[PDB]
Amino acid sequence: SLSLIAAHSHITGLGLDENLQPRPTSEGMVGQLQARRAAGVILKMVQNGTIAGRAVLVAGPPSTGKTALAMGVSQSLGKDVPFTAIAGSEIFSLELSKTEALTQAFRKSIGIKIKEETELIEGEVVEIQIDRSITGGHKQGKLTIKTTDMETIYELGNKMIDGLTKEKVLAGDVISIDKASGKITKLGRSFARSRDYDAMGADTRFVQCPEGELQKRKTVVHTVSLHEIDVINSRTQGFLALFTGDTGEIRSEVRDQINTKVAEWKEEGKAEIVPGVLFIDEVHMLDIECFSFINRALEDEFAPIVMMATNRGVSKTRGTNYKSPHGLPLDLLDRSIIITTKSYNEQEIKTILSIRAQEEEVELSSDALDLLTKTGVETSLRYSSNLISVAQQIAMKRKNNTVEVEDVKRAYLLFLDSARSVKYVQENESQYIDDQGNVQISIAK
Amino acid sequence: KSLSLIAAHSHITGLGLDENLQPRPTSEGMVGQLQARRAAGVILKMVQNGTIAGRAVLVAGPPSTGKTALAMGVSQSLGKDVPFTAIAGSEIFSLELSKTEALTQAFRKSIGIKIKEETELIEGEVVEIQIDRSITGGHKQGKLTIKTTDMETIYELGNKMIDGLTKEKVLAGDVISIDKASGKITKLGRSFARSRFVQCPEGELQKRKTVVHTVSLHEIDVINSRTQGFLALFTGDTGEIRSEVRDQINTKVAEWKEEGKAEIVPGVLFIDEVHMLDIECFSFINRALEDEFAPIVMMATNRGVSKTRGTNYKSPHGLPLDLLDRSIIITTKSYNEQEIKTILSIRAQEEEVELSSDALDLLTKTGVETSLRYSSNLISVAQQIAMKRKNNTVEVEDVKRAYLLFLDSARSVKYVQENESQYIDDQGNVQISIAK
Amino acid sequence: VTRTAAHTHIKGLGLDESGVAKRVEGGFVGQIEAREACGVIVDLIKAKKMSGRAILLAGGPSTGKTALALAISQELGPKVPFCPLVGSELYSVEVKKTETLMENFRRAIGLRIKETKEVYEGEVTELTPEDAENKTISHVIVGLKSAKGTKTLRLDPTIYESIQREKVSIGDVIYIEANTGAVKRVGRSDAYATEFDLETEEYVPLPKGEVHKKKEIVQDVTLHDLDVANARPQGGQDVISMMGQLLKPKKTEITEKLRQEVNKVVAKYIDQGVAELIPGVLFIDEVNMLDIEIFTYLNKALESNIAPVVVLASNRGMTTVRGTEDVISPHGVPPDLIDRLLIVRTLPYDKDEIRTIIERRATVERLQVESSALDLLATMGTETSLRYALQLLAPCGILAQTSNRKEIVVNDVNEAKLLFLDAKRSTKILETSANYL
Amino acid sequence: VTRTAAHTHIKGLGLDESGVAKRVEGGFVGQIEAREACGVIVDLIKAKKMSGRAILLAGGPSTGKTALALAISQELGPKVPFCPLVGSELYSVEVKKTETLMENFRRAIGLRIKETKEVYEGEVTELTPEDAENPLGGYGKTISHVIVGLKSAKGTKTLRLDPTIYESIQREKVSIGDVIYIEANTGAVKRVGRSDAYATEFDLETEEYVPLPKGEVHKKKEIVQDVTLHDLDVANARPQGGQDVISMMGQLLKPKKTEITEKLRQEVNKVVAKYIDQGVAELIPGVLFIDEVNMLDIEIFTYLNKALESNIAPVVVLASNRGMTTVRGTEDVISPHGVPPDLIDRLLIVRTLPYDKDEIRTIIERRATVERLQVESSALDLLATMGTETSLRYALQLLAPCGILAQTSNRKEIVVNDVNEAKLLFLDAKRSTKILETSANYL
Amino acid sequence: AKKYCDVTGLKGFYKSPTNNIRYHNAEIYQLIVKPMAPGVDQEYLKLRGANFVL
Numbered sequence A: 001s002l003s004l005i006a007a008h009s010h011i012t013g014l015g016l017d018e019n020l021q022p023r024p025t026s027e028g029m030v031g032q033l034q035a036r037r038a039a040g041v042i043l044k045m046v047q048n049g050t051i052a053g054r055a056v057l058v059a060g061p062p063s064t065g066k067t068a069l070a071m072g073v074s075q076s077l078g079k080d081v082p083f084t085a086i087a088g089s090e091i092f093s094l095e096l097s098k099t100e101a102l103t104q105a106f107r108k109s110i111g112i113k114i115k116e117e118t119e120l121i122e123g124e125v126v127e128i129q130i131d132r133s134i135t136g137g138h139k140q141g142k143l144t145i146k147t148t149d150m151e152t153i154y155e156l157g158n159k160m161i162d163g164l165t166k167e168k169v170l171a172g173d174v175i176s177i178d179k180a181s182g183k184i185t186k187l188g189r190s191f192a193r194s195r196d197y198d199a200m201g202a203d204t205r206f207v208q209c210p211e212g213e214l215q216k217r218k219t220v221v222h223t224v225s226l227h228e229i230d231v232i233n234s235r236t237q238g239f240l241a242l243f244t245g246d247t248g249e250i251r252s253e254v255r256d257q258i259n260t261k262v263a264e265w266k267e268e269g270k271a272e273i274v275p276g277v278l279f280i281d282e283v284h285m286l287d288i289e290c291f292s293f294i295n296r297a298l299e300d301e302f303a304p305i306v307m308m309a310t311n312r313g314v315s316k317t318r319g320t321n322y323k324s325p326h327g328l329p330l331d332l333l334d335r336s337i338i339i340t341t342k343s344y345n346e347q348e349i350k351t352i353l354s355i356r357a358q359e360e361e362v363e364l365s366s367d368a369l370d371l372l373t374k375t376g377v378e379t380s381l382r383y384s385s386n387l388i389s390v391a392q393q394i395a396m397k398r399k400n401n402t403v404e405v406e407d408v409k410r411a412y413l414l415f416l417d418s419a420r421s422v423k424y425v426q427e428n429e430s431q432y433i434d435d436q437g438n439v440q441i442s443i444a445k
Numbered sequence B: 001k002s003l004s005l006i007a008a009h010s011h012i013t014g015l016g017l018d019e020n021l022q023p024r025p026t027s028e029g030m031v032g033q034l035q036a037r038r039a040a041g042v043i044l045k046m047v048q049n050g051t052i053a054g055r056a057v058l059v060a061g062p063p064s065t066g067k068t069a070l071a072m073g074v075s076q077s078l079g080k081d082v083p084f085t086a087i088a089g090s091e092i093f094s095l096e097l098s099k100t101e102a103l104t105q106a107f108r109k110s111i112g113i114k115i116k117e118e119t120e121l122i123e124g125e126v127v128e129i130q131i132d133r134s135i136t137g138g139h140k141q142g143k144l145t146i147k148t149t150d151m152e153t154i155y156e157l158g159n160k161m162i163d164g165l166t167k168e169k170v171l172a173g174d175v176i177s178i179d180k181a182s183g184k185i186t187k188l189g190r191s192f193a194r195s196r197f198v199q200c201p202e203g204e205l206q207k208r209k210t211v212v213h214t215v216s217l218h219e220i221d222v223i224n225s226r227t228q229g230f231l232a233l234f235t236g237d238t239g240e241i242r243s244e245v246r247d248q249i250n251t252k253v254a255e256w257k258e259e260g261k262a263e264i265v266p267g268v269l270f271i272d273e274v275h276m277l278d279i280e281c282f283s284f285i286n287r288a289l290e291d292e293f294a295p296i297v298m299m300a301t302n303r304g305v306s307k308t309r310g311t312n313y314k315s316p317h318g319l320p321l322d323l324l325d326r327s328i329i330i331t332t333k334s335y336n337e338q339e340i341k342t343i344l345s346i347r348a349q350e351e352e353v354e355l356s357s358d359a360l361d362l363l364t365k366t367g368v369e370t371s372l373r374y375s376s377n378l379i380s381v382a383q384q385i386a387m388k389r390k391n392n393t394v395e396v397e398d399v400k401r402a403y404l405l406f407l408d409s410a411r412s413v414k415y416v417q418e419n420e421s422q423y424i425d426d427q428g429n430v431q432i433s434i435a436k
Numbered sequence C: 001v002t003r004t005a006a007h008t009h010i011k012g013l014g015l016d017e018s019g020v021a022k023r024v025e026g027g028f029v030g031q032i033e034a035r036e037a038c039g040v041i042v043d044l045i046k047a048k049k050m051s052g053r054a055i056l057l058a059g060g061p062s063t064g065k066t067a068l069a070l071a072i073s074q075e076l077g078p079k080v081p082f083c084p085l086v087g088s089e090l091y092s093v094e095v096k097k098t099e100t101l102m103e104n105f106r107r108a109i110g111l112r113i114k115e116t117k118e119v120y121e122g123e124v125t126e127l128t129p130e131d132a133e134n135k136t137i138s139h140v141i142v143g144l145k146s147a148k149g150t151k152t153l154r155l156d157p158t159i160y161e162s163i164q165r166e167k168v169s170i171g172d173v174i175y176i177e178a179n180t181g182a183v184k185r186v187g188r189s190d191a192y193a194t195e196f197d198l199e200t201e202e203y204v205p206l207p208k209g210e211v212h213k214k215k216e217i218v219q220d221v222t223l224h225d226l227d228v229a230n231a232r233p234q235g236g237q238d239v240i241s242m243m244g245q246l247l248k249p250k251k252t253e254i255t256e257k258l259r260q261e262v263n264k265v266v267a268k269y270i271d272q273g274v275a276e277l278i279p280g281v282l283f284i285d286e287v288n289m290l291d292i293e294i295f296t297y298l299n300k301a302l303e304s305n306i307a308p309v310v311v312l313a314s315n316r317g318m319t320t321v322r323g324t325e326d327v328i329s330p331h332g333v334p335p336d337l338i339d340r341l342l343i344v345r346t347l348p349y350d351k352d353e354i355r356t357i358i359e360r361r362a363t364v365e366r367l368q369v370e371s372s373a374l375d376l377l378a379t380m381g382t383e384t385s386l387r388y389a390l391q392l393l394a395p396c397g398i399l400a401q402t403s404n405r406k407e408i409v410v411n412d413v414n415e416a417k418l419l420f421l422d423a424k425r426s427t428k429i430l431e432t433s434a435n436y437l
Numbered sequence D: 001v002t003r004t005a006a007h008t009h010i011k012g013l014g015l016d017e018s019g020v021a022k023r024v025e026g027g028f029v030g031q032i033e034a035r036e037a038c039g040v041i042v043d044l045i046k047a048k049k050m051s052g053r054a055i056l057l058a059g060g061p062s063t064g065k066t067a068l069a070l071a072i073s074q075e076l077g078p079k080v081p082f083c084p085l086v087g088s089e090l091y092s093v094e095v096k097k098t099e100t101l102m103e104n105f106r107r108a109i110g111l112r113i114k115e116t117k118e119v120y121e122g123e124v125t126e127l128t129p130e131d132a133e134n135p136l137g138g139y140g141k142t143i144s145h146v147i148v149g150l151k152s153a154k155g156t157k158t159l160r161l162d163p164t165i166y167e168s169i170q171r172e173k174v175s176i177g178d179v180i181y182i183e184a185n186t187g188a189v190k191r192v193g194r195s196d197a198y199a200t201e202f203d204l205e206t207e208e209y210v211p212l213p214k215g216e217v218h219k220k221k222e223i224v225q226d227v228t229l230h231d232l233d234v235a236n237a238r239p240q241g242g243q244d245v246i247s248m249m250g251q252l253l254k255p256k257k258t259e260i261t262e263k264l265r266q267e268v269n270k271v272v273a274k275y276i277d278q279g280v281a282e283l284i285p286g287v288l289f290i291d292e293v294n295m296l297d298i299e300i301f302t303y304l305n306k307a308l309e310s311n312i313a314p315v316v317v318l319a320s321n322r323g324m325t326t327v328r329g330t331e332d333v334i335s336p337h338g339v340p341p342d343l344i345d346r347l348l349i350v351r352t353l354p355y356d357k358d359e360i361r362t363i364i365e366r367r368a369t370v371e372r373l374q375v376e377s378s379a380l381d382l383l384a385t386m387g388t389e390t391s392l393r394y395a396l397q398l399l400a401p402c403g404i405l406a407q408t409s410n411r412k413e414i415v416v417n418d419v420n421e422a423k424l425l426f427l428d429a430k431r432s433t434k435i436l437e438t439s440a441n442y443l
Numbered sequence E: 001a002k003k004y005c006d007v008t009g010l011k012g013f014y015k016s017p018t019n020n021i022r023y024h025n026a027e028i029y030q031l032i033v034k035p036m037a038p039g040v041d042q043e044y045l046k047l048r049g050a051n052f053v054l
């Protein structure tokens, strides 16, 4: 509901068959048959979950669909599987080192599934009668919990009374108590007992009285990443650092102890390891120290599958003074397999543009689609994809529903691409600030 | 008054200008620089009008020509309760603040909010205090007899008055002041009882007092930031105040001006050595001058076609051309013999240095051949040499002795270049041996 | 008397109902094509459908890129969020620059929440706490009274705790918010002002209006406000603390888990109809000051599902990108980001629209300029720069006012040109002189 | 007997009443014009009138610039605040370098204050609290007042303390029979210790035993205190000394330098000017000495240009061995002594000249007499030739190995063989460099 | 009860310690309360019902 239409919202996964053969147009993915087949092979390895630490480099020219292929892999991966999509610039931080940030990105992409059984008694409290013991030990209580339908009486122990007096629950408060584990919550105050007070308190919350059965059974599946366990065991109250982010370079011995405990919890069967994918978009923006740490960190058994994206040619590696293919050193490319994405022809440009126009609910005419395809082949895919929405707004300002040739031509005239802007800058270089800072603001001499 | 020894700009009491903004040749401690002083008077009238926001001016010229003197004259002619924030260019390179955040704090320290309020005060001379204790101490009663030069009254005190008078112990004969609503008692001091000493105050006790507060926008930003107390106004650990707090402060200040409960006092942000900022600070200044709640920024620099910090190219005044497009430049010129002589005479008159006419001529010749600051520094050491010989007047020989003992820049350069083997050069080579 | 900034005279884009830019309308003159492009952009923003759209305003200095950005801001209205920013502001010494960019991204997505404000104001007449133990009070009966009458309320022990926090006794005018539960003691009434001749009590009048007052308000928050509301290393934002806490809270890298939880809570409140989502504009002036790492994170963050419309400004040409060594790119923006941008070209001006800009700035600043003085100012603007005349307009008015004239004459313009220099004359003085000017 | 350092032999500038310099007095040899200029500067500091006066000591290595700064500090006396500093010390990882420079500027300005202290001192006889009637309200404390009885010599009185003062009492662990000392200015309590009126041989906590304090309880005593402006600034920036919880928790936090604002400094200046106007405090301006001023970069020099123009800035003296050198932090700014010409224009350069053979010889003689060594005349002449040939500092620092080799062979005198053996054992920089140039495996 | 000035009938901010008359401000105190003869305070207190002389 909150999500708007983004650049990759039309992709619902890799458009493959059961034989890992890509369809020409399926699930929002058009073309790139070799790349989609290779990504389908990658997805199966993640789904097998029996091998660890493979580095996959998605390489190609820009606007060819490396990030589109990564989002297709993430959508085909399904839910409750840890997919961590980060950029290469996020590793450089201020209170975390680059290796520690890479370790946190690695351990956020592999988790454990844990099954929980809850016997929840949810209802409004009618009366709490406390049997006051003479010695004070084993304080018996009588809880009158009540739903819309029906109401029982529960016996309450001393720690139950201490938990129900630690948080302030009174008559008319909606609480649910777990029978197996004794978990305590306070959902708030019932709406039936809401008008008795003229002004509500600071922490007073109003919730509806639950209906149906008083006690309900539910099975809850929790997917907890390894980084979550690291942050929890790093501090006394570590759950705040899961959200505020000031974890602060978790020491190694916590990580080895957590790895050994995850192994023994696996061997006794109360949790199961779910591996996932860590996707580093624009991986060329990383230091050589980051690349060396990636090279050593891919060899652990608790390591996810690493998909890296690069649009660089033979470029200078960051942190050094020599050039390298993909902006990556040769020992990183040694422990990697490369998926190459190619450019699109006119039919693939037209199909992707039609899919993006259908996603944004824009009614493109045939001549407007042909003009946008010609502009996409001439300039770029992303220029025509950005031109579609402003042409839609131009046509809507003209009191028209569908777009025509004139709306696309007006959007082409109003908004420039890279080559036209380069030509306009190079024709009048005195009006812009040079690399030496020189400029001519004066219009006459 | 406050703490003030004799400084470099102590003689400047403002801009020596007429009602038609015409500079007098010698007035208010400032001589020379007629066009620069008239331009500074125009900028002062822009500040005093208060209807023009975010104007950047650049005071540029040779060293020892009076750019900082012009800024001090503008600051002295501005008056009280108008915020003048003078900072150097190196002050915004902080370890706990970003440079744009430090520039934001310097910008918003120069815009004040003027609020007038009324308070009922009871300032009087205590005749006597009686308090009758109870059997146990549950209730305390008392009578406070106070007086002024005109009036004399007795008050039946409550419990909180008794507790606030026993704490901060008031005896008979004390002139005190009481704020009734806040319950604060300030002992102004002992009265004229022979048995500190302050006279008995005038009559009409419980008087309305109008207090006019000028609070800078940075202080309200620190206050409204709920994670920042006002102790960060003194400790300095404000720590990157968020932008949304500043937007709430701007909207509240605009609605206070619309409601008439407060006024806006624009001020001057002076940046000495503005070439020491880098290019990102120049871009931030270029955008931040467009705010409605932005002061008038005076910038001083002496560099000429220098390399801009953060870049690799050279720009005029060390400033990029988009910043110089947003600014009007005031140019200061050098001084002749007569202006140097008048400045040296003013500096001697300030430091209570009595010197002869030929000593003044010798100091003027030194300040023409060498520099104005070298002669102005030589004045005080020549005076010390004069009182070493038990002489109350600085003669020619005292100036000659001070010139012999203390060197200028050119003599130090020549004496270094004649004996360059004895010093450490760029390569770290030195011959500490004196023979062979 | 209102102050005047550099962009005060501009009130909007000056377009008609058909989107065609009127030549002189809305504080603008000329620049019709970029104004129409910005009108298409604000129509796209008002559609409230797209995310991550990016437009770059490219043109020379003093051509109106920031003018068009603030014109977009007035065309959208104060309801739509607008985050103006400099590329230099992203370099923070407390948190990393990509986190600052993502925080400014979340600052441009807002929420409207309709809410009620109900206030009980007046003097406490009765304060009777009913205990009904089961030590612990059951409730408290509080009788408030103003000049229009009295009213009795039943309050829970939390509000009784807040009342006893404020040292509220019988006879004190107090303030109670029914929804929040906040209790503020205004002070003692003047009916009890003569119990003692002198006491520390602050005696305030009885409220002239009713005890109970109810009204409707709207809360305009952002997603960054809700992000920093529940991401505090040291909590306690609810308690009113004039003095600071003992440990200074520092800006931290907010994880994506808090962003997803905040998004889930916001979507749950939107699906109930309580809150309304308003996408807004993040404007970055001088985008050439961004590091290449910030450009890479901008490339990653423009593909988010909740990203706002980003408007970038630059005045450079074929320039090396900051943080690189040999990447010559247009406007200082790398070509991977440029492929995601839509470029709006900003043209220079000629003499006539420079003259109308000068006369519009003179009319807004309430200065009377004679016609030949206006022609001299326009000629100086064509010769030196437009901003030189726009900044010399006010010294001309001051020099006219000191001569007891309300009309700016040609001699005032000559005197202001003599007193204040432009960049070219100061550069000539710099080049001719030898000893550092 | 006494431990000696490089500048132990110097007692002062050694000038006459007319300011002229005797050739060998005050531990100084030579540098007559430099000593006279330093005496003029010392008289300028003793005038206590000017602000921001800055001189530069310029010369080669081992010429006596730090010697002249120490002589200035010795001639001014211990009351005048002298702040020695290195240019490298301003680079701090906790706070910016300009704040460190301003902190040293405020540290070089001193204040002498007469302070009246209200004191309740005496032996605790009874200590009974009065409990609150509702202890668990959450708004007050468990007690309301505390009655404490104190007796001094010829006097006994009782005090009713509020719970804050009793909290300060009980944090000192005060019991019955303890002589204590309550300072009413801050609420601070000093526990002097057990009274000697009882038995003092049955304790296990190595406590001290004190008599009853003389005079009455509740005295008013006058203390002369010497502080600096930086002490007031750092006390107000990090508040400790009150009994409120902010002061007490700020006692326990880790101290860290902060950027003290101009508002706090102006408020401190206002309070100090009020102290002066009541005639209770006097201002003593002092000296900030910066040796190796070449280590400062261009930002510290730029801030120094502004900071020297203040009306409270001290007298700043600088030292540098550099000649025509580039300024640190710049690329092409060649400047004399590594100091930019904007600061040089605000300076007064005091030149320092190298020494001759006989001056080096008597400097070696004075360093031998201050280290309690006996040197023969021929060995002293060989030490003088070695000092003129290699370096003065090498000849001064070879005296202690000569004394070690002399006391090894059971002699008090230093013979020529001892200084020859010390020349053979220890090398100067030139002979070491000659070994470096004629070696293969990078000696 | 609200305290009033004994002669002018306005707000009585102050009470004179000698004759126990509550007055309004300085001018009434200097022109009426201070030059008040003995035997004139009794009527002013009697109008308020505080005539202590029986």
Ligand SMILES: Nc1ncnc2c1ncn2[C@@H]1O[C@H](COP(=O)(O)OP(=O)(O)O)[C@@H](O)[C@H]1O
Residues within 6 Å of the ligand: A007, A008, A028, A029, A030, A031, A032, A060, A061, A062, A063, A064, A065, A066, A067, A068, A069, A311, A352, A381, A382
């Ligand atoms: N195979 C594809 N199917 C559908 N859309 C695609 C495909 N490849 C690219 N696109 C579209 O092109 C745009 C840019 O592609 P992108 O994933 O950014 O390529 P790269 O990551 O190589 O720059 C995306 O918004 C995406 O919608």
Ligand SMILES: Nc1ncnc2c1ncn2[C@@H]1O[C@H](COP(=O)(O)OP(=O)(O)O)[C@@H](O)[C@H]1O
Residues within 6 Å of the ligand: B008, B009, B010, B012, B029, B030, B031, B032, B033, B061, B062, B063, B064, B065, B066, B067, B068, B069, B070, B343, B372, B373
């Ligand atoms: N026109 C003037 N009138 C009086 N004093 C001046 C004037 N110009 C300069 N001075 C004095 O000369 C000294 C050095 O000038 P300064 O303000 O430092 O110039 P700059 O800042 O350009 O180096 C200052 O102490 C200043 O008071």
Ligand SMILES: Nc1ncnc2c1ncn2[C@@H]1O[C@H](COP(=O)(O)OP(=O)(O)O)[C@@H](O)[C@H]1O
Residues within 6 Å of the ligand: C006, C007, C010, C027, C028, C029, C030, C031, C060, C061, C062, C063, C064, C065, C066, C067, C068, C315, C357, C387
């Ligand atoms: N077309 C225009 N009509 C009216 N005023 C304009 C126009 N273009 C620019 N201005 C004015 O010129 C001033 C400087 O322009 P600005 O937008 O700052 O240039 P830049 O695009 O380099 O930021 C602004 O105050 C603006 O009000």
Ligand SMILES: Nc1ncnc2c1ncn2[C@@H]1O[C@H](COP(=O)(O)OP(=O)(O)O)[C@@H](O)[C@H]1O
Residues within 6 Å of the ligand: D006, D007, D027, D028, D029, D030, D031, D060, D061, D062, D063, D064, D065, D066, D067, D068, D319, D363
């Ligand atoms: N005029 C002098 N008389 C006596 N001793 C001196 C004299 N000048 C220098 N010295 C000695 O020479 C040594 C070097 O002096 P110092 O000032 O530390 O070096 P620099 O001059 O390089 O700063 C010091 O230990 C000092 O005792």
